[PDB]
Write a protein that binds this ligand. Structure first.
Ligand SMILES: NC[C@@H]1O[C@H](O[C@H]2[C@@H](O)[C@H](O[C@@H]3[C@@H](O)[C@H](N)C[C@H](N)[C@H]3O[C@H]3O[C@H](CO)[C@@H](O)[C@H](O)[C@H]3N)O[C@@H]2CO)[C@H](N)[C@@H](O)[C@@H]1O
Ligand SMILES: NC[C@@H]1O[C@H](O[C@H]2[C@@H](O)[C@H](O[C@@H]3[C@@H](O)[C@H](N)C[C@H](N)[C@H]3O[C@H]3O[C@H](CO)[C@@H](O)[C@H](O)[C@H]3N)O[C@@H]2CO)[C@H](N)[C@@H](O)[C@@H]1O
Ligand SMILES: CC(=O)c1cccc(N[C@H]2[C@H](N)[C@@](NC(=O)N(C)C)([C@H](C)O)[C@@](C)(O)[C@@]2(O)COC(=O)c2c(C)cccc2O)c1
Ligand SMILES: [Mg+2]
Ligand SMILES: [Mg+2]
Ligand SMILES: [Mg+2]
Ligand SMILES: [Mg+2]
Ligand SMILES: [Mg+2]
Ligand SMILES: [Mg+2]
Ligand SMILES: [Mg+2]
Ligand SMILES: [Mg+2]
Ligand SMILES: [Mg+2]
Ligand SMILES: [Mg+2]
Ligand SMILES: [Mg+2]
Ligand SMILES: [Mg+2]
Ligand SMILES: [Mg+2]
Ligand SMILES: [Mg+2]
Ligand SMILES: [Mg+2]
Ligand SMILES: [Mg+2]
Ligand SMILES: [Mg+2]
Ligand SMILES: [Mg+2]
Ligand SMILES: [Mg+2]
Ligand SMILES: [Mg+2]
Ligand SMILES: [Mg+2]
Ligand SMILES: [Mg+2]
Ligand SMILES: [Mg+2]
Ligand SMILES: [Mg+2]
Lengths: 138, 234
RNA sequence: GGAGCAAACCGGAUUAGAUACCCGGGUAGUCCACGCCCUAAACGAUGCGCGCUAGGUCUCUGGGUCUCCUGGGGGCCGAAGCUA
RNA sequence: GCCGCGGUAAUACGGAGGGCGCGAGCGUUACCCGGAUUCACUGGGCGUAAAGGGCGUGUAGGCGGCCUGGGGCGUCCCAUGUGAAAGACCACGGCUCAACCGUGGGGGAGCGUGGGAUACGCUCAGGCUAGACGGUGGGAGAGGGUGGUGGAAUUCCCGGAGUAGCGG
């Protein structure tokens, strides 16, 4: 039935990027959109947009890579090197603000759902809150 | 005036034998054949020629490689008509990657070039005016055009990069850029400067190979005719 | 119930020996019904369900505007990737 | 200690010289944690290395698509009570130092009370149709059960013809 739509979304991204796709659709959810917003603001994706696929709500998601590279294998560096669920149906992970982790000494994000909305670690730490630790992206 | 001279007989090529990474450069599958996008060839053309223009006037070198049979000869015309090196018969393992060593064979060729016009076209033991002179035959056969460049080239122009894959490999390995006339056959991503065309038609190979050697002399002044490039063309 | 086959067993060969391999017999059994047994190289040696990620080729079975397109199933080669 | 040394040239046994390491100690045995990501939460695995249950049905349990609203149990935040002393961390002090000790500061999981947030999880109520199920029409199939039935072959029985071997 699809147990974790967020893990799904993340993985669609992980997969499309590994073959340098220009875009992926992912079935649309408000929650999903909020995570993308962060994702876009932080420059992991180009951006995203609502669309209908067989007349059903998706979110097309424009991916984004490095430049062409030199020697053998000139496949671009990836912008999303790593993207990975934390909290999951099997095992939710919640943090207080004092235990929000520093992802790759801050060269990476952690998206994070709080009662003051979905936030990155920095946004949420300055806003002084914690909550469900959704995923870490570097 | 390139343009419709491409439609001339030089657009589309193979069918269901494709690499799907070549999908962007395809206009359609009319009649079960993959007709390659005419105009995207033009967008790739200028960018490529521009790299050649620059490379040409900087006094650098292209290595022409066409070993597939329809190109065999029209390559050695245009390469000679550009004072450039060419590889024609067999791409040898490490012409580039093991250049130093494969070079030593050029070194040997002109030791035997030096014994035909020589006092020893009369002497040498019996079984050595075949032993030595047949060694010069093969060296003549493979290292005709390769005899020219004596440092790695600055680029390579390849006719069918799938046919000529061992060559491309070495180029990239050494960070020599790769120009290529390629078609639905091939993986574009490992061609730096691509000319989406038709690796098969003697027309296509000709139209492109020649006009590229125009630019090469034309970056140096004083162009010549549209070339001896019509075998018994038909 | 029992034609044929055939553990055991009764004989013939072979062999140094031959409680076997080969030959000739041969009971249980193999067959049916009902009731037990519940094991296996019960193997894809691969738990079930769902989404996602190039293609090509052969095959079984539906539908379409039937050159080709689109489902379901069985194979082969193989992108990305994974693997000691 | 483990790998392993010793069978006439042993840096591995015993002694010598020399050297290394610690030093009022140095070794031994025993026991705990470590290394051991070798029970793996952090942090492992199961095609062939150990490891997928023979297969199903389905109970308890675990997990759960999209939209709106209510509650605020999880979750997050603020304030407050509690977390004794010793010990632990940091200062500054007392014994000549230190060990030992005095004073002061700083942390500290967890639990209580009051206030707040509502993204996600839960819950209550409402909606949807992408999951799931159903309806209409069409299909391929050694899926299963019961009854019937067909021809070939082997054995046996009876009859004919036939004669000296067959079989292996
Ligand atoms: N061992 C092979 C199979 O594992 C299957 O289930 C496992 C696999 O499907 C999958 O495991 C994947 C693995 O596929 C793939 N090779 C990559 C990944 N490292 C593994 O993942 C697993 O291990 C990593 C830690 O290594 C964990 O962080 C992760 O959460 C866990 N899913 O997820 C399951 C987690 O164990 C089945 N149990 C069975 O088919 C067989 O045991
Ligand atoms: N509370 C005041 C005194 O505090 C002391 O507590 C302190 C000392 O014992 C100890 O402090 C000293 C440290 O300050 C000084 N700069 C260096 C010294 N190595 C430490 O000493 C300690 O550590 C070493 C090794 O851990 C050991 O000798 C021993 O654990 C202890 N003496 O650690 C605590 C903080 O410095 C005594 N333990 C206590 O009996 C006395 O009351
Ligand atoms: C086969 C041959 O020349 C030969 C010679 C002498 C004796 C044997 N004996 C044979 C003997 N008849 C044997 N049977 C056999 O070989 N067959 C082909 C039936 C029997 C089972 O004992 C054998 C396997 O032992 C054997 O092959 C020998 O091994 C065979
Ligand atoms: Mg995808
Ligand atoms: Mg608290
Ligand atoms: Mg060769
Ligand atoms: Mg016997
Ligand atoms: Mg027998
Ligand atoms: Mg018998
Ligand atoms: Mg299989
Ligand atoms: Mg299939
Ligand atoms: Mg000795
Ligand atoms: Mg020793
Ligand atoms: Mg000794
Ligand atoms: Mg451990
Ligand atoms: Mg684990
Ligand atoms: Mg293991
Ligand atoms: Mg095993
Ligand atoms: Mg199984
Ligand atoms: Mg079930
Ligand atoms: Mg249930
Ligand atoms: Mg839910
Ligand atoms: Mg609450
Ligand atoms: Mg205390
Ligand atoms: Mg003092
Ligand atoms: Mg409290
Ligand atoms: Mg409802």
């Amino acid at each position: 039935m699809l147990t974790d739509p967020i893990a799904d979304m993340l993985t669609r991204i992980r997969n499309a990027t590994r073959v340098y796709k220009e875009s992926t659709d992912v079935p649309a959810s408000r929650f999903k959109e909020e995570i993308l917003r962060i994702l876009a603001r932080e420059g992991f994706i180009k951006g995203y947009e609502r669309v209908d696929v067989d007349g059903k709500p998706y979110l097309r998601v424009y991916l984004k890579y490095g430049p062409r590279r030199q020697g053998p294998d000139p496949r671009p560096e990836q912008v999303i090197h790593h993207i990975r669920r934390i909290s999951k149906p099997g095992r939710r992970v919640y943090v207080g603000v004092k235990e929000i982790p520093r992802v790759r000494r801050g060269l990476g994000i952690a998206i994070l759902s709080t009662s003051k909305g979905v936030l990155t670690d920095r946004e949420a730490r300055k806003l002084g809150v914690g909550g469900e630790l959704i995923c870490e992206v570097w | 005036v390139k343009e419709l001279l491409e439609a001339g007989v030089h657009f589309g090529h193979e069918r269901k034998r494709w690499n799907p990474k070549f999908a962007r450069y395809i206009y359609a599958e009319r009649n079960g054949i993959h007709i390659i996008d005419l105009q995207k060839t033009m967008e790739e053309l200028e960018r490529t020629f521009r790299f050649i223009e620059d490379l040409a006037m900087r006094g650098g070198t292209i290595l022409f490689v066409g070993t597939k049979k329809q190109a065999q000869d029209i390559v050695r015309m245009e390469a000679e008509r550009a004072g450039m090196p060419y590889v024609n018969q067999r791409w040898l393992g490490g012409m580039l990657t093991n250049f130093k060593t494969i070079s030593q064979r050029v070194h040997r060729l002109e030791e035997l070039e030096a014994l035909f016009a020589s006092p020893e076209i009369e002497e040498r033991p019996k079984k050595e005016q075949v032993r030595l002179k047949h060694e010069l035959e093969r060296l003549q056969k493979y290292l005709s055009g390769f005899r020219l460049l004596k440092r790695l080239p600055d680029a390579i122009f390849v006719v069918d990069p799938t046919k000529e894959a061992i060559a491309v490999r070495e180029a990239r390995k050494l960070f020599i850029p790769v120009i290529a006339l390629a078609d639905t056959d091939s993986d574009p991503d490992l061609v730096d400067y691509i000319i989406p065309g038709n690796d098969d038609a003697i027309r296509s190979i000709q139209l492109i190979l020649s006009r590229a050697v125009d630019l090469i002399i034309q970056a140096r002044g004083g162009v010549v005719e549209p070339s001896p490039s019509y075998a018994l063309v038909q």
